[PDB]
Ligand binder design. Structure first.
Ligand SMILES: CN(c1ccc2cncc(NC(=O)Cc3cccc(Cl)c3)c2c1)S(C)(=O)=O
Ligand SMILES: CN(c1ccc2cncc(NC(=O)Cc3cccc(Cl)c3)c2c1)S(C)(=O)=O
Ligand SMILES: [Cl-]
Lengths: 298, 305
C-alpha cells in the first residue's frame, strides 16, 4: 500500500555527471563513452561564430576530482559535444529518446557536476516542465530506465518567467517553441493530462479509495466535450486502449472512470481527498501506476 | 524557482542492496563493509509471526542457512548476530561500493529518502517523513522488507530507517539501523494500530516560508499571535504543538523573508479557519508537512523573490 511520486534509482546517471566550465560560465555535462554533452549556451547569439573562436583547452571538464582532457568539440542543434580523451568507465547501457507531452521522467538535479536531488516530473502539454531548479542546474538530465538501459530524454537549459523550465532532448532539439537566448519567451496555456489523471484514479481504487466511483458511463465524444471545457487534453482511443489493463484489474471500464472524472470536474472533491491530494494529479502515466502497483526492479 | 518533493540521489545506497533468503522467506539487506543488515523476521515462518521467540529461532540457524545474493554473485555468510530487531550477517567479502556512512536515529517530523527494493534490486526512490505517530506513509509491496531510508548530507550517507512491516491502515513501521523500532510497534503479527496522526506544524510553517521565497504572499495577514494561543488553535485542527525549539529552528527563514515566526503562525491559523478558497500554495491545495526547515533552506534560493 501507499502511492508516492517515485523516481527511478539515479545511480546509473550519477556516474555520468561532470562539471563543464567555459570562461566564467559553469554548468553540468553528461559523460557517456568519450563524449561530454552539455547546453551550447556554456560558450555565451551566433553559436557557430562563438564556437569557432574557442579551442579545446578553453573547455574545462571535471569528473569528480579528476580533470578530463578535451580533444575535440562539435555542436548538434542546442547541445555541445565535447570529445574527451577518456571513455567513462561508468557508462551505462543507454539510448537517447525524445518523449511526448504527458510522458514522465526522473530528473537528477546537479550543481557543479555534483548530483543534489532526484525528482519525478512530466512533460507538460505546453512542453514545459514544472521542475525545481536554481542557477547552476543547466545540464541536469531527465531519464527513464527500461530493464538495465537508461533512456536519456531531457537536458535542462533555462527557466521561463513563470518559474517553469525549458530544455532539449539529448540531440539538442528543444521541447516546445523555445530558443536558447535571453529574449521574451512565455509558456503557452497549459492543459491537464487526462490519461494520467484517469491512471491515478485507477491507482486510488487499487489502494482502496472508491468514494468517487458511480454507476454511470459516458461516450468518448461526450467526455471530450466536457473535458475541453476544463482545459483537459482530449482523450483518444489510444488512451482508452492504454488504460485497458488497469480497467480489467479494477473492474471499472475506462468510460465508467471517465464519468467519475466528469462529476469530479463539474462538482469538485467536496472536502474529500484522493490519495492524500485535494487536486486531480496528472503526473503518473498508466505505466507508472502499473509499475508502482507491481514492483518492477532495475 | 520551483518547489518539488525531492529525494537524495540513490546511487550510494543502490550499491549496498542485496537479497537475503532464509528458507522460503526472501527480503532485502544492506551490505556495508563485511556486514549485511536485514529485518530479523527473515528467520520466521508465517506461523511464527504471532508470537516468535527470535532467540530460540536464531540459535537453530547456521551460517549456510542464510543465502545472500549481491547482483549475480553469492556472498558467503561467516557469522551472524542479532541486535534488537535487526539481523547482522557477517560476510567473507567487504562491499567495495561501501560509501562513507553513519547510522542515525531520527525524530518525528524529520524527512528522508526511501530506496524501495524487491529481491535485492532497487525499483524506486521517494521522499517521505517520520509521522508524529512514528509511522511512515510509504509505498511498499510484499518483498520490500529491508528497504532503507537515508539522507545524504555532503558525501556521507546517514541511514535512518529499515522497513519491517505494513500496518492495517496501509502505513508502514520500521526500525533505525540498530534494530530499535520507531513507535510502540513490535515485529509480530499481533493486533497493532497506528496512533491518531497529526500534522507536523513546524514543517507546514517552513513550507509557507518556501512559498514566500518563491514569490507567493496571498495567505499572509496583518496579525501576530502568542505561542500559547497558536497552540490552542492548532490542536483543534490535529496539528502538533509548536515548541520554542521549533520557533528557534524557523529563525533563519524568518530573517530571510522578513516575516516573524509568530506572524507566520497567524497566517497558518487563518488558513486553517478559511481553507484555500480555490487557491493553491506551491501547486498544492492542501497544507504540506513533509518539508523540514532544513529541506526548505537546502532546496530554495538565498534570495527571496
Ligand atoms: C540566475 N537565475 C536563475 C534561476 C533559476 C534558474 C533555473 N534554471 C535555469 C536557469 N538559467 C537560465 O535560465 C539561463 C538562461 C538564460 C537565457 C537563455 C538560456 Cl537558454 C538560459 C536559472 C537562472 S535568476 C535568480 O533567475 O537570476
Ligand atoms: C498484506 N501484504 C503486504 C503488503 C505490503 C507490505 C509492505 N511492507 C511490508 C509487508 N510485509 C509485512 O507486513 C510482513 C510482516 C507481517 C507481520 C509483522 C512483520 Cl514485522 C512483518 C507487506 C505485506 S501481502 C499483499 O499479503 O503480502
Ligand atoms: Cl531528527
Amino acid at each position: 500500500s501507499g502511492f508516492r511520486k517515485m523516481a527511478f534509482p539515479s545511480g546509473k546517471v550519477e556516474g555520468c555527471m561532470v562539471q563543464v566550465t567555459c570562461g566564467t560560465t559553469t554548468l553540468n555535462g553528461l559523460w557517456l563513452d568519450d563524449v561530454v554533452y552539455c547546453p551550447r549556451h556554456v560558450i555565451c547569439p551566433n553559436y557557430e561564430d562563438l564556437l569557432i573562436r574557442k579551442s579545446n583547452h578553453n573547455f574545462l571538464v571535471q569528473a569528480g576530482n579528476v580533470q578530463l582532457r578535451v580533444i575535440g568539440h562539435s555542436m548538434q542543434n542546442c547541445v555541445l559535444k565535447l570529445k574527451v580523451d577518456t571513455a567513462n568507465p561508468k557508462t551505462p547501457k543507454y539510448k537517447f529518446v525524445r518523449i511526448q507531452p504527458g510522458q514522465t521522467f526522473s530528473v537528477l538535479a546537479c550543481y557543479n557536476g555534483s548530483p543534489s536531488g532526484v525528482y519525478q516530473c512530466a512533460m507538460r502539454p505546453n512542453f514545459t516542465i514544472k521542475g525545481s531548479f536554481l542557477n547552476g542546474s543547466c545540464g541536469s538530465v531527465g531519464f527513464n530506465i527500461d530493464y538495465d538501459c537508461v533512456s536519456f530524454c531531457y537536458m535542462h537549459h533555462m527557466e521561463l518567467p513563470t518559474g517553469v523550465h525549458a530544455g532539449t532532448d539529448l540531440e539538442g532539439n528543444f521541447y516546445g517553441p523555445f530558443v536558447d537566448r535571453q529574449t521574451a519567451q512565455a509558456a503557452g496555456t497549459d492543459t491537464t493530462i487526462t490519461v494520467n489523471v484517469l491512471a491515478w484514479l485507477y491507482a486510488a481504487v487499487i489502494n482502496g479509495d472508491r468514494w468517487f466511483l458511480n454507476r454511470f458511463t459516458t461516450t468518448l465524444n461526450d467526455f471530450n466535450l466536457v473535458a475541453m471545457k476544463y482545459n483537459y487534453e482530449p482523450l483518444t482511443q489510444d488512451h482508452v486502449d492504454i488504460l485497458g489493463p488497469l480497467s480489467a484489474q479494477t473492474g471499472i471500464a475506462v468510460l465508467d472512470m471517465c464519468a467519475s472524472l466528469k462529476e469530479l470536474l463539474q462538482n469538485g472533491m467536496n472536502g474529500r481527498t484522493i490519495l492524500g491530494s485535494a487536486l486531480l494529479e496528472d503526473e503518473f502515466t498508466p505505466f507508472d501506476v502499473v509499475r508502482q502497483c507491481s514492483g518492477v526492479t532495475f
